């Protein structure tokens, strides 16, 4: 009747967001009096693209395909937060909590590995004005925080770190330190990402929405040791709306 953990375990389904069937083309009424919230937000990436970095800036850099090497470990889920109604009828989702990040490594043609913290941490996303009902026309656009892929305790292979670790290349006791400044002095990245959620299906009765998303964010900079890359993530999403 209804799937259990043991039906699902090891199939790959646990990394998939819930779907809605083709008859779910309704509209979910919004009431300016009542406060709303997203009870569950899920994001399932289906493609990862990395912007190439050519030697010459005269020709435009394109986003290219990558291969996922870290397996079915990529989806964000159990995300919740307030869904506010704004004076102009627009809606604002303010992300509070949930499984809102996954470390992800993709591999470019020729082998170069691109680790990233796929995330919507601190997401604040808004609709168009005058949304009396969320429909297959509604969309959310917003910005989120991308903190360092490694947190401050992380130690490099020579035991150097930010909130822990050596502060020099100890294997080279008398080397000049200037050339090694960037590797020796760890730095914690915090940058902005951008995301659009295109609502494609709505179940007006249950308060459930689904569609596609596209996000853009920087990859891992390995605590300031190298320049990050621009990543574009596409996939499907699911959300349940509730009165708060």
């Amino acid at each position: 009747q209804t799937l259990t953990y043991d039906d699902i375990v090891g199939t790959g389904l646990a990394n998939k967001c819930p779907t809605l069937d083709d008859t779910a083309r309704g509209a979910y009424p919004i009431d300016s009096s009542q406060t709303y919230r997203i009870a569950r937000l899920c994001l399932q990436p289906t493609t990862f693209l990395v912007k190439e970095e050519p030697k010459n800036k005269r020709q435009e850099a394109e986003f290219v395909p990558t291969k996922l090497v870290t397996r079915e470990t990529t989806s964000l889920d159990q995300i919740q937060g307030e869904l506010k109604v704004n004076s102009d009828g627009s809606l604002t989702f303010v992300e509070e909590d949930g499984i809102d990040f996954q470390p992800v490594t993709v591999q470019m043609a020729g082998g170069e590995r691109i680790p990233l913290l796929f995330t919507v941490k601190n997401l604040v996303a808004s609709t168009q004005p005058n949304v009396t009902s969320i429909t297959t026309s509604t969309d959310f656009k917003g910005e989120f925080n991308v903190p360092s892929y490694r947190t401050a305790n992380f130690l490099d292979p020579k035991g150097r770190g930010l909130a822990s670790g050596y502060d020099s290349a100890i294997a080279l006791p008398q080397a000049k330190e200037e050339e090694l400044a960037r590797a020796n002095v760890k730095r914690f990245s915090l940058t902005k990402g951008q995301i659009s959620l295109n609502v494609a299906k709505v179940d007006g009765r249950t308060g459930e929405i689904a569609g596609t998303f596209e996000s853009e964010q920087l990859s891992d900079d390995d605590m300031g040791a190298h320049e990050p890359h621009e990543v574009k993530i596409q996939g499907v999403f699911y959300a349940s709306i509730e009165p708060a």
């Binding site: 290219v64 395909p65 291969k67 470019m108 043609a109 020729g110 082998g111």
Partner: protein, 56 residues
Amino acid sequence: GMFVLPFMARLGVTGSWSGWSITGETGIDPGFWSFEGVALAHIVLSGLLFLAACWH
């Protein structure tokens, strides 16, 4: 300074198992007959010929 790469490319071997092609494409699938597969085949051939030499 590539010497044998052009000869592979001349007759249709243009891709790598690592996903690049010499025409600049990404995400292509060359099948077995990538630059690497060609290299592998020649190494195995070399070994088989070596053994055949011994017999003869």
